[model samples]
Target chain A: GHMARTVNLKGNPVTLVGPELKVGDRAPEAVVVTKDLQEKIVGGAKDVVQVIITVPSLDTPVCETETKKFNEIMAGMEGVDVTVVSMDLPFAQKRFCESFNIQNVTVASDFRYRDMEKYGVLIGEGALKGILARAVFIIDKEGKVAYVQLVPEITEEPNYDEVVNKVKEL
Target chain B: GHMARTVNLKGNPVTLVGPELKVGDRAPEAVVVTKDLQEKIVGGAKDVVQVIITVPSLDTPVCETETKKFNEIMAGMEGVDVTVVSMDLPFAQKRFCESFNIQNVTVASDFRYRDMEKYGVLIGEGALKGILARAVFIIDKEGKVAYVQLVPEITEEPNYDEVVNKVKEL
Candidate 1:
């Protein structure tokens, strides 16, 4: 069985669908969309480390803040290919990245909702069941998982200090 | 069995999901979304004519031309509520409307795919399966369907000539 996570939405409990990944586990490839509606293969990128940040949607306050923060921090962070993954459509992600002038950060969509299943970060139930949970993954250049962070609350931001420091090492 | 439509995708055959809707039947209500992501109920609004146009996605060329044309003609056409419905997210729809300065037709999303099933215009099989077929519906002030048009080819535009003429009568 895939790992089930107990996360919170407001005051209610929610399940983060799929399995929990570990440091040595190989990250699987997921089909994602670019801002231009092109399909992108992220997990298989050869020479670069990947920082995958999953969010429910970009329309919310915390999600916007979290991605925007990453848009700035990830650019200056070294040797990392940082991409924010969401169930939002490619056009929505494009608008968000353009509006905030997000540079060096790739905003991709799992609009088909495949990232939730393949990445194991999709929220299992609740109003956000089909959306991605607030999770982070740092994949090493060898395509092995280096770090994983799944925020326990839907509304809270991930620990930026921990995320950035880990990427510096990758 | 629901009616099977032999629509085309790049000149190949595709099956459109759901049964055919006929005129004089009571229009079925569909779950749509607003720009702010709230559920909207259509087909039940009284005292006004409604032209509901369904598309695969607003990001495509024909779909863009199809919608842009409707957005222009639907305005001042009559006492009508014209909306473009799709599987795209509300945020995606909002951005398209905003970028194009679309002022007349309401752009709504059926991202949940429920509108595809509920409206009986869901594409049945193929890569485009689970999305909406190119279709149009017109409901009269009496709450009955005045017209239904399902484009035989998915890549082509709906018969806007007949559509506007029908709304003129309603």
Candidate 2:
């Protein structure tokens, strides 16, 4: 498939860089970082279901709320790990999570831009070209994609109720 | 001159990724960013004195003080602009500047990793292989590199007195 798709930002059409992933695909192993700046292998980590949430940046209002929703719901779920991946620096991601009191989920960064190429969230064109597109993927412990959501619009939040329901299955 | 130079980070020798800039050579233009998330064209900007600083990350002790020194000295000076480029994202840079009231110097990110190749500060290997090395360059109105300092020791400060004197010469 063409690695790019036309995605809208503030109602303007710009290219979203990276290929698509869906249920049943082999989840690619992506190395992003926690707020501590250490690496975490997403979708590839063993023994736990992976809830991978890709967002543009935590600096935006919509992204922040979307993150809080996931962080809240995933709390106390045994054998489940949720990771929020963005282009935000790990330090900023630290500040963001702390500000929102989001302690349950892991906050990670693709700021190095390597993860963008591998994860397929690289924004190809426009002022926001270097950021990730808001999307989500759930990979089971077997490294098989159990669920996926590439939010058609960057400004809108992912269907939170649907995502929570999917995570419960894993 | 060979682009490979042994620069020390935390008191150990390591190779840097790009070539050095020195007196009489024209400097290459680098595209960076502002806190507002807009693109800032540095080094290659025409007809202005460019004081470019490349630090590994602002979340360091030495880098923080060094930036404060430059921002303090360069404030309100005519015909000059100072930009601090780092692996830290623009938001982290913004938080650093505001925390220390460091509004004088413009902080930019090499998080996208392109400027690392263009600016000649790439950390060749280490935990920081993809990050910038600690260095500074002063380019004159004609794009001729006037004064450049690839701080021999990353843990130590650039000769601030000498850098200020060089900027005055521009």
Candidate 3:
């Protein structure tokens, strides 16, 4: 039996297991599973950096805003691969992106891979409730985590300034 | 300008307003509007004890668990009326209730009135949302709130003992 604290994501408790990575730790390499069932290692080119933005669920307001903000931000920036990861179904994500005119960022679903647990963002049990605290991890070309931020409040914004600056420096 | 947060029953942030009530406050009285436009109130009771149970959105997990739990509890209890309020559509609520075999509890929607805000449980703003921190308020026969428990962790269970004790005492 797994005992974990759950938080409401949209109204459900997502059981969070435990902390995975912290600042200065090597970021976990994730396998990006595309909508068409294609899988690819998220890290590649020496000059290409990867930014994994994890959200609890996209059915709510904050997750949508964060993804949209990053979408716009990524559109303006060059040479970075930004993936917005969430447990929301791919179809729902596509609809949200289309509704918001989000084009630059690639929205991916973890519903299939239990990517949330793989990434250590899953919270609560039973119904998989709870919001994954707002988290941002920036992986440099060398695949090392150059920046990390887990929003303290379950209902606040991530440190975008620091995240962007770290990405830029990298 | 209103600055309130809304989330789906699953804890995803949504855009809703009102329904903010606190302990000791008189629970808001409203005619339960039906699809046919008929309305009914908790009337003709010897003692009208209202327990306002606010959920994020009824479409998700934890909210479902909470609803089912309340439904079972309500079926066993007498006199006290438990209203499961959420931002879900009436059709959805009806379907969910039917699917879960929830009969004793009255599931109401705030889709039109945004009652969640009037109760002060709404949290956060924007696309990624925050929801009503899982909360339970018990009102006495005279409509004065007698007990309150706001589940501290969004993903956890509300204080069942405290809520039940208050209702029993009332």
Candidate 4:
């Protein structure tokens, strides 16, 4: 279904589904599959600050760079838990992590339930439909959404420096 | 939902969804995504004999070997169309084809619609749930399902010789 918000896919507007999440709201729990086919619970209350990132696919250039950038930016940050999610299968995710040596960020897949839709990042229509859009959410230790970033263009990358500043402030 | 048919993962039995397609039934049309991010229609009537193979994922060992074997077997066969479908995203499928130099059999993804569930191979329960089980269907020129091969086990390869012989008959 169409939501009020839309993101550009190479200048063409496309609809998104699910409720729009914002700062100060309680982060909903979304289930994603780890590389080993194990269920990983993202969002909600955690002992550490949770950085949940969603991308359309890791195989694409923009997503690949975005994931690598986040991994590098968040490395060694104390009390922070980071995860990158996409519709890519766990198998593909595993291969990607291995190839890229992605250690700081835990790459996960939303193919099982498309759970990222709860964050209002699921592309509802167009060629990229059924995939997650480029977005980031910073959930505080208390499970409150401290910061949210929804990339206006699906083909572009998110503001990395801004996310780093926000995470530092939290 | 539960279906009468089931496939084994390692040794444990897992339920599947959708109807149990048989040899004499008309082939059901399933929408899939090609490596180019384009929609591809599998099954149904076509000018050539259609070979539709469903695997859990192209990243796994058994499925990789099975796909290569099928590609090698069908490379020179005239009037036969071979397509291998999995839950892998088109981006991953594109990378896989490039890595393996998979030129003969068309590698496609069923992630878009999960349409292969209509063929009764979608795993409904267990760790492998929501993914397609290992199976193969051969549709004749008239669109009737000429042959069906459902691998009882999820981790093993299918009978390649049997499929080749059946395709020869068609």
Q: Can you write out model 4's per-residue Cα lDDT over A56-142, one digit (the tens) per residue?
A: 999899999999999998888998889999999999999989889999989999999987888999899988889998888999999
TM-score between model 4 and native: 0.94
Return the number of clashes found in candidate 1: 3
Which runs in model 4 stand beyond 4 Å of their true positions? A1-4, B1-4
lDDT of 1 by residue, A56-118 (tens): 888668999999898877776667788898877665676687779988789888765375466
| Poorly placed runs, candidate 2 (over 4 Å) | A1-4, A97-100, B1-4, B97-100
- What does DockQ give for each predicted structure? 0.25, 0.41, 0.02, 0.81
The sequence of per-residue lDDT tens digits that candidate 2 reaches over residues B42-127 is 86647779888888778778889999999998899988888888877666787787789988888887665366566577878765
Model 2 Cα shift for residue A55 (angstroms): 2.0
10 residues in a row with least lDDT, candidate 1 chain A: A1-10
Residue pairs with backbone overlap in model 1: B17-B122, B17-B123, B17-B124
- The sequence of per-residue lDDT tens digits that candidate 1 reaches over residues B1-170 is 11235577778887655566777778878778867667777786578888898888886678899989988887666588888888776656766777697878888887754655656777776566556888888899888888878787888787788988888776
Cα lDDT tens digits for candidate 4, B109-162: 888888898899999999989999998899999999988888888998888888
Stretches > 4 Å off in candidate 3: A1-15, A35-37, A43-47, A125-131, B1-170
Docking class of 4: high
B42-70: candidate 3 lDDT, tens digit per residue? 32222767787877656657778888887
Work out the TM-score per prediction: 0.71, 0.88, 0.45, 0.94
Candidate order (DockQ)? 4, 2, 1, 3
Task: State model 1's lDDT.
Answer: 0.77
